[PDB]
DNA sequence: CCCTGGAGAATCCCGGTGCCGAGGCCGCTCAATTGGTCGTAGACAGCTCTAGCACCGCTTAAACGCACGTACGCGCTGTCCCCCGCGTTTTAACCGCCAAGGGGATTACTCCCTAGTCTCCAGGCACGTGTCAGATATATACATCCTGTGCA
DNA sequence: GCACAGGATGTATATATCTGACACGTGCCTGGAGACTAGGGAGTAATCCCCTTGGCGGTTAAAACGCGGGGGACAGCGCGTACGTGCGTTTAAGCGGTGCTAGAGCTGTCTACGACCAATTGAGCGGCCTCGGCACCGGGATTCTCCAGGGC
């Protein structure tokens, strides 16, 4: 067989079934969502890398991710994303 | 012996692959080291944004009396929200069309 | 016989094409134009169908946005017809 | 065996003996080829001694060469009048005015160069440095030498950039903070020996090193008047709102950048902040007094003073505190006067003259501590109230002796209001350390 | 070959303009629009061909087109 | 009777003068006050390096100059000589702000 | 008990200053409503830039805003500034 | 017997610091490995661009009748040149000013 | 003693003395030149990094640098700089 | 000068089709677990320079308020011309189908190029220091603008 | 109603002083060059098969073209308003100071805790194959619009 390909399709489908239990998605819409997720990941990761370089630090951390989120997303989305990420990190720290 | 493997995504109560995100951060040449919390934070942010956009797109799809999300629904959801229009201002969606908007001077009088 | 005023058919077409979501240029002429433009940089260039489709999508999106800016400039000039001067002003303000 | 009598070239009476001894001191100081500080403070005037030195040079020596005197704009006219009255032979020229007047003056008098003494101000010197630098200078006089106490300042650099063969500094308070400014002054006087910035090992060496190029007298040779001062420090506790804001700021919307500066006025009055005021009606009644311990004590003290000799003076270092005190005084039906930085010269002088009338109905006079012009003859007053103390004990003493002018013939009493267990105590301790340094170095 | 720029016909330009939201179109708009399309396409295709030549390939991919658009600030979601 | 220039020559002379010079055309202390006032909302107890405010003033003046150029182009497009808020709004709308 | 406000800070961007900026832009005649609009535009621009700068400063664990932070903010906005570092 | 330490800038005939460029590439997190000829190529490109800008700025300095280059001369050189204007289209040069340009309609007639 | 800062000022001065012998430069102009060189280096290096990631390699080469130059620089500058870089690499390889 | 009345366009409820998304299986590779180490960043301590807050002083340039005249923005009108709506003929897009082969994607192999380490040494940087390039001022010399006047 | 003189204004040009930054010299130290070794990434050859290109024929929608007409573009005219220009006045900017104290950068140490690397491994995820529901296409009946003509 040919080379396997990686995509966020399974997790996008899971979150879709979670938010709207009785709604499907098309292949083109899934490709759009996959490109969207890759692009957002690229933006956040690049901004965090630049932050670490600016502050003369050699590691990317939760502080860098949070600061990149506040720099890139506008306003209310930034607030919600910060709260959700902090919730996830607190739960991961408490459960490990 | 070793305990049954517990996914870090399940530990954080997420649904996006934190392990895959950590690998992508390590292979992406962003920095030399990656902390433990950065993959979890990034996966949560990605999941939140995906949930927001998919919720708006699903509402738009139900407004058109369909059950499948299509690029038209995605474009409607993105362009009819200020925050998402700012985030995706310079993005083109394949077969998304345009928002219906006619300047009022052109309307018959 | 029956006949329409000069401008109602245009408004109906505006609604139709702002409600539709497909492409609006002919695929074979666009493909031939793309190959002709690519003639100047290399010989015996081959293309994927997806490449031509993506080029057509981007070209149409750019042209639609340009026409929206042109219409805004024309309305600013207290006109309903759009003109080459309107297109040139839009390009100049954009930075092209 | 020196200039023991009043000169023959000085007019309008003879110089007094305690002045003519300083005159012979200056005369011998030139022949000895060293430059020193005249620190006799307010006697009968260092202006007459300096004019006598210049006149002695020009008459007895054949050196009428270019001389410059650097005085503040407030004393420029007084110096010109003294030149015209006492020793009229010297042809002093005053350079002050806008750009057109400066250019006209230089091209019409300064470049022709018929003058002998040029009296100018600090600002005019900074503006006309380029054309003042050309002339060779035989005598440079800087009245109020404490202006150049700090090195690496524009005036301090420019003044020594000139070509001067003699130097002289006049100051009544040479020492104000520490010995580095004294070293700066001595470096200006003669850079060749004080090149380095650095009671048997000390004290005596300082005295005998400073004696050769410094002199100071005490305003007690004649006396016969000017009763001494009584200094009382009143410790007043913080009020409820003062205490709450004090704790709040100490543990810390309001902007609080400079912590010491924010604790200070807060010890004074919480109304200098935002949100500590009562309701929007802004009713001025008993809110000002009750919320400040100093205000309560002041409301207790003032009626006693007005039942007594009265004519009280108030010194404060914040114009907003002045505003609050003014509002309280106008609410309590006390007629007052205000001297402040923003008060123009005409209103300054008119208020001073009105208060100085022997039969005056005005009771309270409020002055900002440093906003004086180093003159201000408020000799008709009796009580000096120091609402807050400066870091400079010499600034405090100058504000204190502002009421100790020669026209004052009654005992004057000073009240310092201090809040116990605050930063006011640290202010007082620092001022006491600086004052003991001043006394041990100069007076002893 | 040649004479392929004129394959972008007047009706297609009118359809694009109607989707833009205009009602009356001047007669000289068509040549201007063809020139604008030509310059835009030339830039994008130049970048895509550069990417393809670095890849050492004879075939232009949708990936190459997407990368060119992204480096021109005109991101395209829907192809990868 | 007194000599007066016509309405528009002094404007052209000023245009040439300010298109020749390079200094800053906003008062530094008012600009610094404005920057501090704006920053106060985002955070309290902030200190500014003097270079930061200078860079902010440079960027702000460049932005305003470019905006005014595009506004003048729009006004000339409308067959006018005066610039108006509608022209400024059109320029910002085209640029995407 | 004495309070007296002076003026808005944004009124410090004066009418002659805006006129000078317009002259550099190349404008001849100016309408009287331009000044309020320009003050609003400057306010929005500064708010965005200062938000980015203060975000950088807070990440750096500091309370002083630096020229480097301003440069990084402008570079994120897409208005690269040369000469300040 | 160690040969004379001869620098790679002189080896390539450049005037820019090839060694510093190589160190910056290695520390900058662009890829895990760097070729030998890449820093030489990059230094050559940087030198050409600097030389072009400096030549144009010196010509502008001669036009203004001065022997020193200032940011005004740099801005004058960067504008009036199509290639450099495209390259630095969104760059602000501090205390650089604007080109003299008056629209034809505004001129008196 | 103050710390050490790295600047391209020496090499900029060398290029200036080579191309315009009897000329000078001010501190602000030198700072602008430093920022310009840093910006160009950053753009070219980032483009080469993305190229290496796209083609699935872990080595930045002169080929990657040349492709990044052709992608960034506009036309005549691109070709002149490519010729210069080829000459420099030829000199480096041939004799040293 | 708004109120019928027809054409034409769009919308809504039904029915047959197909094809693509959702579901269920198989195999693999990649993440999770456990163990060990190191090196980076958090913490601390000492120094040196900048910034904030409350003032003071002086100087003077710039903002402000005002009055007046004059271009100019804006509305109204007339003309024409050109763009639009519609019908007819022509042309090639499009869809389906087929055939052939270039080249993209993959695998195995081996080399050669780069990372890493050690050692030595000279280029680059901070610090002083003097002198000249340019900013400023003044004083002519010329280019521009505006107005009045004279004339055909 | 047009074209020139001159007067006032502004702007350029030449030259003299002076000062504050730039260009150069010096000491030294830290990063770069010379030499070597090890290992895996990338170049090279060969194979497969898939995706590209060429070609043909039939339908039919879309394009090209022509005609007739009404609406919009544009030039012109007049006016009442709002802005440019110059002037006298006020105000706050600008510069130069005080007095203290914290903040930040740099240097120099220390230590421990978190991140990297390795071997093992089983569970997760990607590819594949199949089938029913959703979307689509086609059709008939119905509402809503727009335009023309007239008695409102
Ligand atoms: N005619 C006079 N000659 C000398 N001294 C006088 C005369 N009249 C008054 N004085 C003294 O001069 C003092 C005031 O002058 P002062 O303020 O010392 O001058 P300055 O300001 O120059 O120091 C008074 O104390 C007074 O005793």
Residue numbers in the entry:
A (entry chain D), I (entry chain H): 27 to 122
B (entry chain C), H (entry chain G): 10 to 118
C (entry chain E): 38 to 133
D (entry chain W): 166 to 363, 377 to 430, 443 to 634
E (entry chain F): 22 to 101
F (entry chain A): 37 to 133
G (entry chain B): 17 to 101
Quote the study that presented this structure, word for word.
All known remodeler enzymes use an Snf2-type ATPase motor to slide nucleosomal DNA around the histone octamer, but the precise underlying mechanism is unclear. Here, we use cryo-electron microscopy (cryo-EM) to visualize the continuous motion of nucleosomal DNA induced by human chromatin remodeler SNF2H, an ISWI family member. We merged the datasets from all conditions and performed extensive data analyses to determine 13 unique structures of the active SNF2H bound to the nucleosome. Based on the conformations of DNA at SHL2 and of SNF2H, we clustered our 13 structures into five groups (A to E).
In group B (tracking strand movement, 45% of A-D particles), the DNA tracking strand is pulled out more than the guide strand, deforming DNA locally at SHL2 and SHL3. SNF2H adopts a canonical open conformation, identical to that of ADP-bound ISWI and with similar density for the bound nucleotide,7,8 indicating that group B structures represent post-ATP hydrolysis states. However, the position of SNF2H relative to the nucleosome is different from the ADP-bound structures. The other group B structures show gradual conformational transitions in SNF2H: relative to the B1 structure, SNF2H moves further outward in the B2–B4 structures, with the brace helix moving away from the nucleosome. The lobe 2 movements pull the nucleosomal DNA away from the histone octamer surface at SHL2 and SHL3, with both guide and tracking DNA strands displaced outward but to different extents: the tracking strand is pulled out by ~6 Å in group B structures, while the guide DNA strand is pulled out by ~1–2 Å in B1 and ~3–4 Å in B4 structure, concomitantly with the gradual outward movement of the brace helix. At SHL2 and SHL3, only the tracking strand is pulled by one nucleotide, whereas sliding of the guide strand is blocked by the brace helix. The dissimilarity in the tracking and guide strand movements results in DNA backbone deformation and base tilting at SHL2 and SHL3, which is necessary to accommodate the 1-nt difference between guide and tracking strands. From the entry site up to SHL3, both DNA strands adopt the canonical conformation but they advance by 1 bp compared to their position in the canonical nucleosome.
